[PDB]
Design a protein around this ligand. Sequence first.
Ligand SMILES: *CC(=O)N(CCC(N)=O)[C@H]1CCS(=O)(=O)C1
Ligand SMILES: *CC(=O)N(CCC(N)=O)[C@H]1CCS(=O)(=O)C1
Lengths: 304, 304
Amino acid sequence: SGFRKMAFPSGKVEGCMVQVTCGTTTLNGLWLDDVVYCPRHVICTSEDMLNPNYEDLLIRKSNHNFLVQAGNVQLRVIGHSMQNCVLKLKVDTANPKTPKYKFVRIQPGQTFSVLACYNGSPSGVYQCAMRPNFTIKGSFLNGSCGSVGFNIDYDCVSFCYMHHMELPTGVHAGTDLEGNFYGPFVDRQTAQAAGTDTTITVNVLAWLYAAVINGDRWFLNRFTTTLNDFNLVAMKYNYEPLTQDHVDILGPLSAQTGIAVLDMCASLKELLQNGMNGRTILGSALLEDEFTPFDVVRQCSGVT
Amino acid sequence: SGFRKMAFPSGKVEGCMVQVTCGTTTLNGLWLDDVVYCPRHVICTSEDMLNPNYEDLLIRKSNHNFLVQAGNVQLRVIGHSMQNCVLKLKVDTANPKTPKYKFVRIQPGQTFSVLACYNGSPSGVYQCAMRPNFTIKGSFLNGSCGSVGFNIDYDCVSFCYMHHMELPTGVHAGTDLEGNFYGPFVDRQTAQAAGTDTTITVNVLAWLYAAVINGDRWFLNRFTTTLNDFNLVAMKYNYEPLTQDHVDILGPLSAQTGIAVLDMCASLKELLQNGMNGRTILGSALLEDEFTPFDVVRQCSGVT
Ligand SMILES: *CC(=O)N(CCC(N)=O)[C@H]1CCS(=O)(=O)C1
Ligand SMILES: *CC(=O)N(CCC(N)=O)[C@H]1CCS(=O)(=O)C1
């Protein structure tokens, strides 16, 4: 019993972290096989970040200008190329600690773990969600760029995020491992406002199921609703619309608890309309949306 | 910017996890050097747990009855001994992945990361606090016993907890790595009620400092208080009494923000007396107490 914001074990990713320095800028790189992946803004000074022409800045850079250090040993750079907003530095040595991996581009609402690093060294691990406005609410200081987000399925690491930017609002933006930013964000120090940060409804429902499994049941009511009625309430409270795809994904949780998805939606509707009245659910005083239905099943069954 | 419930990178601990089986019971073990540490209740059936005589049960066990598997390979057991509530199984092979380590017995209010494991395999990592009633609010299912709590200082892992029990209330109890339980708990399936779960006041203050650093300042007020006045309020709300030792530990946070500790206590006093009024602090609708002053400094400075 018990339910925690759990991150994936980070060891497989720790073995991939390296430090990349170009000129006076140092950030983190991801070493998989004989390629080091890092944000292209490693070639920028803070002044360049105001209005960078990455193609023009990259011309003035040769292989020997990219210093890559794994632990206390230097990797030899034998090629470099820019793919969207990431640089791929070909090194002469395959990373012996390379795990089985995939590059995946996640959808908003999906969760992942972040291994925060500085100077190629891991500082901590935490669980995040890609917000519906394509930002992440992370914990990143200067030098954390190049830290990555990932998911693990038995022995396969699916890298989904690479940290690049902090918006003026203190929220974070980055790319998938192909260098394409999530959302409309660009690797430029300019006004980039985020859109409405809506609540991930399917995740809140999954967390309510996790609460029922773990004993927190005070919020269960005698009511039911319909998808259209629930969605009128969801729109009012800046919750994402719930679809039949979401109901289907909640099927195993509905079956395990015996609570029909629409009955759980009716409990959620009352929690939105009446609030928690000073009560808590799984140790939280707000409706948690950073657990997917898959996370709840995984945690509640002990998948390793 | 941003503040997250961050766990230590778990790689160094992942390399120590093994599966231990004795008869029909399987749990996790910690392999450091040529010793495997695991809960002594590995020798129990669920029936034995009702009223176990560990010395008598252990007599019927020989080295060959303890099956230790690291990954997919079997470790040879050449000795066994019981130290308090843990078994120490001497193996013929030193763990090549043994990190620099120490065994530490933490105080209530101290935080640590837990690497939840099943069958010797890591499932996830999360950050915990030893509650003032010596329980932890974890996420542990059957087979999670032997999972460990730890802290890391650069390259040294300080193991502080080993999971043993789930109390009938769904909270968790365990030992330090010498096998001594935290609190009055015993490794027996019997009525073990926990005492009052008070709030770790020094940690809440540290988290309020973290909020100020990160931009959440609405709760700062025009008031101050004294340690005795604050403590009258703390007692009323089941908060731990604040001492001059706690004020001293909050000194660096007080200096960085320019907010005197007693002024922050006065903001906390008003938050206790008036509530949050539907507002949030660092994305939480309740006062968070699982960040020590050391955790706040570490996270806010990027210690690797
Ligand atoms: C190195 C890095 O990730 N930066 C952001 C640091 C934080 N706090 O996320 C760096 C990239 C361009 S930037 O102007 O956002 C500063
Ligand atoms: C294997 C283990 O840790 N147990 C507890 C499982 C949970 N949910 O923490 C196991 C040890 C004795 S017990 O009766 O608590 C069951």
